[PDB]
Symmetry: C2
């Protein structure tokens, strides 16, 4: 069944009931200020870093889930309810939530009163704005009191929920009932000491009353659904001192029948230079200038409506670089709106904060963030270029890298492990995708520190050299790269041997030495090793390019000789040089990661799909018999049913879950792309449709999570919950699936010299058009597609048959028309 | 007002309403298994380490507070309620909670049904047992279904609530409806991998049904008060796979009028040797032998009643070493029951887990744990002796110490900072108190590693030498000890200079060098420097003792010359050698810590209370004019009203809270003891009564927290919440207040050569008797007390006047009668 439906004209997902299988969230903001907002107004907001600057408090694993957030309590002659349904859970006559691009609306109506709240983060603002429209839909007059509500976090989210022994005594606010445009409350915890920032929570009318103390507003022994102040019908005017600061105004509203009233609430992040912090000599009063400035920018409905319209315009421009028109409207929906939109979210937030990721331990992953670029280069290239510099700056001089870094400070840390040997090659992966998209080679010349260290700056191209050489100088006995702590698969820990609990595998000390090798990193070196060689060559460094091609050539032979099991690729060699991922074993015979990535690098590829004997065809066929399920390909098979002490975290998950037999969706695109490489478009599209949101919308009761974005993992076939997703929104899946569908199934992809047009999608999409803006020119590409295996497109360029599948770049301002037959 | 009352005959605090100002908790267990239990059955259980082996889940900062726990849902013909009131919050005809020693009972009755639950951790058991008595108090028959409930934590409490991205997929159980004595559920998360332990949750009858999945039992969009299974009236028989494992049995009960039924529930921690983990070859099934064993030990009411009775006997024996009889029944209550009981809790749990301490970041503090001993040596000396070895083993070889260590592993860590220069001298403090209590000098000869390192073992006496010398070799320009990161006052950070947020002061890198000195550590070196010298002397090391006495003598002169402000002692010298705690400044003129501790070391003490000119008398008088409040003495005065960037965390608290003007209760005893040293017993008792639980019981609406135990901090007079406590139960206050009241106000204290009897308590306790068992002999001490300043007791020993205030130790088995006049 389903719990909503897409509105494509409006670019929304419409949720038509509060009763979803799980809270379904949207992200607001796309720059430096971000809100997680569920279809029940639950979630929170943070500036730049969800661990370090979290404005509002959110409880994960709450009972019930998502039972805190941005609430508006409506008092109608004693009867109190919330338009978001939760927390009060009063019966409503109408409920609807629309999740849009950077905005959502939530409408709830009861006993002839309707509240619509629009939530968004305005372009160029560090604030979350709410436009509330209250409508009398009844026959007679209405006298209402509205109580806004939000609960502050004390900035440090980790301190906020572990350190009450100090926390309970630092909560400080300032109250401003007569603000120049209404009323505002200031959350200024720790402003007295080191923080130069505070939050403001304001309404654009004179509020009747306020509250800043949670225990007063909610009342003893009470849930947010039983909150006392809204029930008494008048604010308490509480002034927090320690305990739990909140933001809350009451507003009196009288409405004739059919009359509506509009209110604008604002939650802002404000920052004063240290010299400019105090209004007063005594340093007791926050300087409020910048906050008033913000509040004057949203003092009226007109201003709010214009900011909303600017945000539409912003997304319209962003979505204008790639789109498609076909018979398949789910396909179209994903390519044109939701996947590109999700890619923007993953670029900004990485893997740190969702309704699964707690925005505590994880910042920006070195490998996750490089991979996110592949899906974001087309959207905003300038910000993509800057991010590459920031990531490369967390690389060490020996070519090894900080596994992740902190969003606020941009500085690397070892909080979730160090010494993952697959990390360095990803840097090449993102830089090359950026230069193909833009033609901007000048980034190779940007100076970049090692470990953020001044005076260590060398050109970014030299960072890429260190990345290539790191692998070159860390190969094992078979010539395959030494694995280290792990590769892309974080739970493949062959240098660990921990039999005692209490410490994560990701951070636990590793035993030095051994010969543990990785076929995945091997594939990775072949793929990104070439890209690095081609950059060196274009740079004019011919000896360098040739040496590297030599090393790539060698790793290719090593992969086929010592990394090949007979019917598929091996996965690794353990610390003592024993194979992993062989038919010789009873469990974990076949792993997806090497199969997809090796065939993507061209390894084992023969002449046709017809040439079944080619290693790539076998590995892929083995993958279809052993790994593929209705809901996607599982990670390896069979799952391990007992702890493999020499292998780390992988076998610690119950079978069918996560790294042990789960469907990691991120790995799927790799196989799908491989299928297009070997010419089986129909198979490749099928893999695509099984894990793609628009196609799984009709089994929303199985998937459970959002029908409009990719998830990290789906319960695999050895799991009793097979089909159910976890960890939605924040996943490499998004970027990699965009790369897959846009560049290999539809087949329009940037190269340094031209646009390649080489579709491979099968009989299910007989005709389509791609509109692609590249290098300042627009390419209109019409494809007539027979779907046949092994059949690749023949180009006509501006009415004239041409050879090959590459169209060289036209001057900006040009319009090129490409017609493809296959 | 009050919310309960003491029952002294039963040794209980009786809470007569659910509606307390804050959840009021008790601790169950006194060995290796521990439960936090509130008067609403909220809380959780853990084995040895509250961070690492937490069986059950608990939410801090919940809305409402304490809304999860060990519940029993009563279904009476469709009407569902809980005897603990929360979570359902149904009206009850009767409610009562009794908090006892290692046990509590909770009774709730509604519509002619009464449930009494007794909660305890049995002596010698790693389990929490519940004896439930259900009574039909109505006129007709009752058919009830009872639903037990508890929610598991996944052992690692920190992982459990930050790491859902992995957590949601590892939850595993086993269900055993036909257990040999009833029915049991097994929580076995991560047993598949590195854990050799699992939890069992069982009932001693055949349960009608079970649930192990929280979302099924509670139902979507529901709180625990709206839980669905109890309302439908039959279990769902859910088998968790990932998500949120719980434990739950339904039991059918039919009762004639006035009939009662008894049920025994058990929550156990079980551990199998690695060889003995599986029942089966396949390793899919936990070996259940040890769990069945446990369950057969509580299969009947009779067995449960005997374990309860053994626990009474255990506390009776423990409380038999020190007691008193006087006119003051609040005084008596504290000395005889609650303070000694609290001292046992602090010895076991330290500062790690309460309703304020999250049982995440803190293990066993090196200084907290040494100080806890002073209050626990008299109770169980054998376990005290062992703890001293464990603490000393976390000391480094240069004499410096790990600031805290992990309870499970006993290993030191720097999680909450390193390099606190007051830490090493505390080790002397606890060892000396142990040897005075026991006469066991042989502990000085026990071999002890530095940093838990095998082969580094030296005799404990040598650890004490390193402690003394560390101070000797780290003194500043005035001869006072260099402060380091901080002293006993953790927020006095003079080597910090951090103006950027995001990192705690306690762990943040300190700037090397400077001359920051501490007068507190100075006092500390004088007090514990003598104790170390006297041990060296008794050891026969005469050169060593004399050298040390020389150094103590010097530090005494340094404290009076360069640590004296004129009317009180200075607090410190900052990094550049500028004073802190001087009348020359507008804020923080006077700090409590040096005043109490210096006068306790004898520094500045003259001939009489009459000699007002003596520095000790001045400092104490300054302390009464400037620091003392109705609720206790604040830490310093005036509070700082702006960030002092050169001073660390202290000024980051709002005035009147914690280290910035709060009443730290732990520091109070030091002044109180000092008052007895200078002979002002009436003043000393007054300070005592202001912060002591039995005396503050009549302002329970002000104190808010438990009326039966000490808290860490009370809002100081510059706080708008002046009088309100935070951080109850876990505080050095307990140990230090026991030392104060038992050894200096009542004046009976152990010395190596005899019992000293030297009461100093004032006119409010004109007569009393102390019964003190020391060295195997019983001393009966009757005191006739005029209360007069400067008047010290004259002893009569077994009917015969003697000189001095020391009674030498009699052979075990002896009874000595001491009569004191003053």
């Amino acid at each position: 069944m389903r719990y909503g439906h897409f509105d494509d004209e409006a670019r929304e997902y419409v949720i038509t009931t509060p009763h979803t299988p799980y809270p379904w969230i949207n992200y607001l903001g796309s720059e430096q200020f971000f809100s997680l907002l569920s279809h029940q107004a639950g979630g929170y907001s943070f500036y730049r870093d969800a661990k370090m600057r979290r404005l509002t408090r959110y409880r994960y694993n709450n009972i019930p889930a998502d039972a805190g957030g941005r609430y508006l309590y409506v008092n109608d002659g004693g009867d109190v309810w919330t338009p978001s349904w939760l927390p009060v859970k009063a019966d409503l006559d109408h409920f609807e939530a629309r999740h849009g691009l950077g905005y959502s609306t939530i409408t709830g109506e009861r006993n002839g009163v309707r509240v619509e709240t629009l939530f968004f983060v305005p372009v160029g603002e560090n604030a979350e704005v709410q436009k509330v429209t209250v409508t009398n839909t009844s026959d007679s007059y209405k006298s209402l009191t509205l109580f806004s509500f939000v609960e502050f976090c004390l900035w440090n989210a980790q301190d906020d929920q572990t350190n009450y022994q100090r926390n309970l005594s630092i909560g400080e606010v300032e109250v401003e009932q007569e603000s120049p445009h209404g009323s505002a409350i200031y959350h200024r915890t720790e402003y007295r000491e080191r923080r130069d920032h505070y939050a403001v929570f304001a309404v654009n009318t004179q509020a009747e009353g306020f509250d800043t103390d949670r225990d007063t507003f909610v009342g003893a022994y009470n849930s947010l659904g039983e909150a006392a102040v809204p029930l008494k019908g008048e604010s308490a005017n509480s002034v927090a001192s320690g305990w739990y600061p909140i933001g809350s105004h009451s507003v009196a509203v009288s409405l004739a029948p059919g009359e509506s009233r509009e209110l604008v609430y604002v939650l802002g992040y404000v920052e004063n230079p240290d010299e400019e912090k105090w209004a007063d000599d005594a340093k007791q009063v926050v300087n409020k200038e910048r906050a008033h400035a913000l509040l004057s920018r949203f003092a009226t409905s007109e201003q709010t409506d214009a900011a909303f319209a600017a945000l539409k315009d912003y997304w319209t421009d962003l979505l204008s670089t790639y789109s498609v028109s076909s018979n398949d409207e789910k396909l179209d929906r994903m390519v044109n709106i939701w996947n590109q939109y999700q890619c923007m979210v993953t670029f900004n937030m990485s893997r740190s904060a969702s309704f699964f990721e707690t925005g505590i331990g994880r910042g920006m992953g070195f490998r996750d963030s490089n991979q996110d670029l592949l899906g974001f280069v087309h959207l905003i290239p300038e910000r993509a270029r800057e991010r590459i510099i920031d990531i490369a700056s967390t690389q060490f001089a020996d070519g090894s890298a900080y596994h992740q870094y902190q969003p606020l400070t941009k500085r690397g840390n070892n909080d979730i492990g160090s010494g993952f040997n697959d990390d360095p090659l990803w840097l090449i992966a993102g830089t090359a995708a950026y230069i193909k998209e833009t033609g901007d080679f000048s980034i190779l010349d940007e100076p970049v520190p090692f470990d953020n260290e001044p005076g260590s700056e060398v050109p970014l191209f030299e960072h890429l050299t260190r990345s290539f050489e790191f692998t070159v100088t860390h190969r094992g006995p078979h010539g395959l790269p030494l694995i280290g702590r792990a590769d892309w698969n974080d739970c493949l820990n062959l240098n660990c041997f921990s039999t005692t609990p209490g410490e994560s595998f990701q951070t636990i000390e590793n035993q030095a030495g051994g010969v543990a090798e990785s076929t995945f990193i091997a594939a990775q070196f072949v793929l990104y090793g070439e890209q690095y060689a081609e950059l060196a060559a274009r740079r004019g460094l011919a000896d360098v390019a040739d040496r590297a091609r030599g090393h790539v050539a060698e790793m290719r032979d090593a992969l086929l000789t010592d990394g090949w099991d007979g019917s598929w690729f091996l996965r690794a060699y353990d610390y003592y040089g024993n194979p992993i991922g062989t038919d010789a074993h009873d469990e974990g015979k076949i792993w997806i990661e090497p199969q997809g990535f090796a065939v993507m690098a061209g390894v084992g590829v023969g002449e046709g799909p017809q040439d079944t004997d080619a290693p790539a065809i076998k590995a892929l066929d083995s993958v279809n018999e052993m790994l593929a399920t209705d809901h996607g390909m599982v990670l390896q098979y069979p799952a391990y049913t007992t702890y493999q002490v020499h292998m780390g975290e992988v076998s610690t998950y119950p079978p069918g879950y996560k790294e042990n037999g789960g469907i990691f969706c991120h790995a799927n695109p790799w196989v799908i792309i491989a299928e297009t490489v070997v010419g089986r478009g129909g198979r490749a599209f099928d893999y695509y449709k099984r894990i793609t949101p628009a196609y799984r919308e009709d089994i929303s009761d199985v998937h459970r999570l959002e029908p409009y974005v990719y998830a990290q993992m789906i319960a695999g076939k050895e799991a009793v919950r097979h089909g159910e997703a976890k960890n939605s929104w924040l996943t490499g899946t998004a970027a990699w699936n965009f790369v897959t569908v846009s560049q290999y199934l539809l087949g329009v992809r940037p190269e340094y010299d031209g646009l390649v047009v080489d579709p491979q999608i099968g009989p299910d999409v007989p005709s389509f058009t791609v509109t692609r803006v590249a290098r300042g020119a627009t390419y209109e590409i019409t494809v007539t597609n027979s779907g046949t295996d092994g059949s690749r497109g023949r180009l006509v360029v501006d009415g004239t048959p041409v050879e090959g599948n590459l169209v060289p770049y036209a001057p900006a301002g040009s319009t090129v028309r490409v017609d493809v037959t296959l």
